[PDB]
Every structure is written in C-alpha cells, then in structure tokens.
Design a protein around this ligand. Structure first.
Ligand SMILES: Nc1ncnc2c1ncn2[C@@H]1O[C@H](COP(=O)(O)O)[C@@H](O)[C@H]1O
Ligand SMILES: Nc1ncnc2c1ncn2[C@@H]1O[C@H](COP(=O)(O)O)[C@@H](O)[C@H]1O
Lengths: 320, 341
C-alpha cells in the first residue's frame, strides 16, 4: 500500500499516448505490425548491488536487458511490466528498484504499464528480492531484421558498453573473494571499483532506431550471456565467419582489473564478459562511414570491430 | 589457477539445456501468427487479422502461496497451468483474446526435470487458452534460492478491439448475473489453507475427502475460462465479467461494476464444493471470511441482459462449464456493493 502510492507517479510519468489489465494501442504508423517480446532477470548483479547497498540503477539494468534484445530485430519498445518477488517487502528498496525501472523505460520510449509485488516469506531469505522484466515491442513486418541479408564482406560495427552490464557477475564476485579487496576503496582510473561494476547497462534503443532509418542494417547482436562466442553466431547465416579485430579497441579498465585479479584466460574473458562491446552491427561496407558518423555524433562509442567472411568453419567467431 | 564461470555457480547453458528439452511441448502451442522460433533475441508474433483497431492487454502474475504448497507435497505438474490460468482469465475480463505467453523461471541450481514439468504445465495451459508459449527466461541464483526452491512468473499479452473493450459501463439495473463454477480454490486463499492445515494438524496426503486425497482438492489446477468467455462475448451482449481472485466476492465483484450499482447474490443458487466445507470446518472460518478468502465454487461472474440468460447458459454448459444464474444487478442507493442472500 505504501509502495503503490510512491510508484503511481513513476507509472504516470512514463505513459505514452497509446496507453489507455494494462491497455495499450498500437502506434498509428505501422501497417503490418509484428509484436516483439522478451523477458529477463538482472542476475547475480542483484546480490552485488545488495552487498554494496546500492539499488539505485538496478532497475535500469532490467529494462536495458529487455529493450536491447527487442531493438535487435528493429522493434520499437512499447510497454513494460515487472514482477517483484521478495520475502519481506522493503518499501524503500522496492521504490528504488521501480524508479530505476521507470528511468530505463523513459530512455527506451516505452511505458511502465503495470506490475506485481509478491511476498514469499519462506522462499527469500533476508531482504533479498528477484525482479523479472517484460517488454513488448512493435516492428513493421517488412522491416524485420532476421540476419538473412548478412553476406560475405559485411563490416562489423561495435557499440561501446558502460561496463559488464548484467552478465558475468558470478565470476565478478568470485574474483572479488579471492582478491579480498574492498570495491568501494579500491580506486580505478579515478573511480572506485564498485562504481565500475555497478554502472547500469547502456540502453541502445534510440540510437539503433535512428540507425535503422538511415542505413541498411543486416543484423544486430546484443552481447549478453555467453559474450562474443554465444551471441555473435545467433545472427550469422550459414557458412559465414565473423573475424573480430582485437586491436581496434581498448578494453575498459574494469575488465583489465578482472582479468588480472582472477587470472582469467583469453577465451574466458570474451565468454563471460562483454569486454567493452554492448552490441555488434553487421552492415554492408559502403554504409559504414554513414553509420559510424551517425552513431558517434549521437551519444555512442562506435568503431569498426571486424568483418564477416565466407567460411564453412565450425568456429563461427575468430578473435585475433 | 585461472578462475572461470565454472568456478562460480551459474551455467549459461543450463537454460540452454532446458530450452533444448522443452522445444517439443513449446512448438505444439504455436499459433499461425507466431513467426520464427525459440533462441532468437525476441519472440515474433503478428496481430490477428480480425482486429481493425487492436488494443494490447497485458498482465503479469505469480501463483504465490500455492507455489509453496505445491513443492511441499512434491507435485509440480499442474502449477504451470495455474500460472497461465490467472493471466488468461484476467485478460478476457476486458474482452481480450490471449495471444502469447512468457515465463520467468528462477531457482538456485536448475533441476531440468522439475523445470521441464513446470513448463509442460505452462504449455498445456496455453493450449487451453489458445495462446502460444513464445519465450521465457531461466535464471540461476544459487545464493538467493536455498534448497530446491524455485519461483516462476508469468506474463501474457491479449488483443481486444478498441470499440469492444469491456469496462463495466454497459451494466444496468436488471442485468442477470451468471456464475461459472470453479475447480477448487484456484490460486487464491492458500495462506489460509496453509494455516488451516497447520492448526488442524492435517496431512493433506493421508487425509481422504470424498474418496480422493485432500491434496487433490486443494491443488486442483485452476479452470481456464478463455474459450467459453470469448464465445460468450461473440454471441451474447456481455456487460461485465468478474474474476473471483484475491478478495473473493467482496473485492472482485465491485471492481467491474459501475458506480451506484449493487450485485445481489442468491446464496441458494449453488452449494459450496466439499473442499470449501472442509476448509470452513477445519479452520472454524466465518462464512463472511470464506466469501472474502475463497471463491467458494464461483470462479467467474458475468453480467448480461435478462433475455439472453438461456442462450448464455446453453453456450457455457455446452463447453463443459458449470453455469447457473447466481444473482441480479440493482441500483445501489449509496448502499453496499455486494449482497449475498
Ligand atoms: N512492482 C510493481 N511495479 C509496477 N507496478 C506495480 C508493481 N506492483 C504493483 N503495481 C501496480 O499497483 C497496482 C496494484 O497492484 P496489486 O497490488 O497487484 O493489485 C496495479 O496498478 C499494478 O500494476
Ligand atoms: N523458461 C523458459 N521457457 C520458455 N522459453 C525460454 C525459457 N528460458 C529461455 N527461453 C527461450 O530460450 C531462448 C534462449 O534465450 P537466452 O537464454 O536469452 O539465449 C529464447 O528464445 C528464450 O525466450
């Protein structure tokens, strides 16, 4: 009861004109609208945000995981829901989470149109909580990005990440335990290590939506669980191989610290962590200069990261 | 020593292995509108052609307290049906046709057997609802979920024509109320069920009720009313639909009724199913509390004009529903919204 009164303003402030047990009409511009949907959790980053007592941006990570997966197919995020499960409801912690959710929905252009708070005393111990996200997007049927147009000679453009995002934090913590350092006191390029690790996931919705209107995009890969190895081949057609130019960008320093402190090997770094790349965009080579100029001039760190070449190799991704 | 994800406790390919097993039961729920398959970054589904001004109806749910009792008695096949039922039954309240469903599964270490049986119930509920299971998420949080505990959440999206949204405005003095029988407590009132089971010292497995174990009455999967309600809206003027969930008769009936209207419930029009008499006896529960906590055999109530009752009862009973006239609507002169007599 004390929660719904505090979150009524954050639901109303995200309301789109299409919003009217949650009612939402389709945007008027779509002729053959196709609905794009997905659900997600934050992951182990919750328990790291709990240990540091900072839940401010954890709701941004939840929305970002959703909406970045929708926009891969060219979908425009429409509305969002959450399922907040906890043992004993901390009104202050839940309000901070939902506020971060509202902030992520505003960056995505979608409305927080409802949700539920459930209390399970025997299941969750302490003040722990698990939040499930749900987003629905709309894409024009003729403009769905399926990756079939990915051909030999396409160039890969990377979008820089704000940090580890919401994947790999089970290894992050395990590295913190063996190293035995305080993330709040361990300074790292002028900031504490905790700030590098708790940085919310970058939301790529608006910049990728602008890119699709202006250049011909063949495929987009959101680097989440599994990193480069698992997520890049999901958008590759048969008999294609992505060759990442490792020298084309420097790792953000947080990933250097994680490798040294955990003695993490090369292949494992690119599986568990994004290593500074939030998304990879496959597009024809003549479109690259237009895309790089658009993305970099509109709040993104974009650079040429690799190429797609014809290859029947079973190793679909090469990082050399 | 080179640390890795293997040294921790999350296995990304555990959910990938679960998706590897459940691809069969998921594919069987696929609708013609569904495009693509599992594994992609997002689930694709077109709008049904019938809607010229389609409005999307969405909801999230969790079976909650009933999930606790399902683990205790070590039965997790029907709890997926309960998850879908609470979603899809709420969609049709406003006239929405269910389109697709997603689920969020969280636990400590993933038991692929336990999860696949839960998903199989979710897929079965989607078959009954006419919607598709088009995606989900499987998260492993070893420190947060102790023992074999797991938490599942459901999300659903339905479609309704803009000009046909049911908002209770068409409810008028004289509308006859038709009840749809429930299959049991459905998914609400299970904190009181657990309490009654404790104060009475009752093991619901070694306790027989009408020849069946009491655990079969308590954990009966929620009845899904989607196909019956959609046909009702298509063939009969439906003014309001009450979904008796948390809060029983007192809370859920006025939620769909317009202001200055009152629902009069004929208590003699039905007898409580035996599971509710047991819960009332074993807990010494006031009947007013039973009408607040449990649905008491009535899962849904439909408001419609009086001349259309016989046709509606004919349709509902034809789909295997337990339908009967439960009451009427009358103008509330600033009175009580629900009256059971
Ligand atoms: N965690 C949450 N996030 C957003 N909205 C919520 C949440 N929990 C409840 N609500 C909203 O609060 C109202 C009452 O929800 P309930 O308590 O489930 O009846 C509805 O409008 C819900 O959508
Ligand atoms: N519990 C689940 N039930 C149904 N589908 C799922 C579940 N978990 C994951 N999926 C689907 O499996 C695919 C793999 O998702 P990801 O784990 O993000 O690679 C996606 O299409 C998901 O929607």
């Amino acid at each position: 009861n004390a929660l719904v009164g505090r979150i009524k303003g954050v639901v109303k402030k995200t309301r789109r004109p299409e919003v009217m047990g949650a009612l939402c009409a389709l945007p008027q511009k779509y002729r053959e609208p196709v609905l794009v949907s997905g659900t997600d959790g934050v992951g182990t980053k919750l328990r790291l945000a709990m240990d540091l007592k900072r839940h401010d941006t954890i709701g941004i990570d939840l929305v970002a995981m959703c909406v970045n997966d929708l926009v891969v197919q060219g979908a425009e995020p429409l509305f969002f829901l959450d399922y907040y499960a906890t043992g004993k409801l901390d009104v202050d912690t839940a309000s901070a989470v939902i506020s971060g959710i509202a902030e992520g929905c505003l960056q995505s252009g979608c409305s927080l149109v409802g949700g539920e708070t459930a209390e399970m005393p025997g299941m969750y111990h302490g003040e722990d909580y698990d939040v499930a996200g749900f987003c629905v997007g709309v894409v024009e049927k003729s403009e769905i990005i399926d990756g079939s147009k990915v051909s030999d000679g396409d160039v890969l453009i990377a979008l820089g990440s704000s940090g580890p995002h919401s994947n790999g934090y089970s290894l992050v913590r395990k590295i913190l335990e063996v190293s035995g350092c305080d993330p709040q006191t361990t300074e790292l390029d002028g900031k504490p290590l905790a700030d590098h690790l708790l940085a919310p996931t970058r939301i790529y919705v608006k910049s990728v939506l602008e890119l699709i209107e202006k250049v011909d995009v063949h495929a987009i890969a959101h680097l989440t669980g599994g990193g480069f190895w698992e997520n890049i081949p999901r958008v590759l057609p048969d008999n294609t191989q992505a060759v990442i130019d490792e020298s084309s960008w420097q790792w953000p320093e947080v990933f250097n610290w994680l490798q040294t402190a955990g003695n993490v090997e090369h292949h494992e770094m690119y599986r568990t962590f994004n290593c500074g790349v939030g998304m990879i965009i496959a597009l024809p080579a003549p479109e690259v200069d237009k895309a790089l100029a658009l993305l970099n001039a509109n709040g993104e760190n974009a650079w040429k990261i690799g190429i797609i070449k014809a290859s029947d190799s079973e190793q679909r991704v090469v990082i050399e």
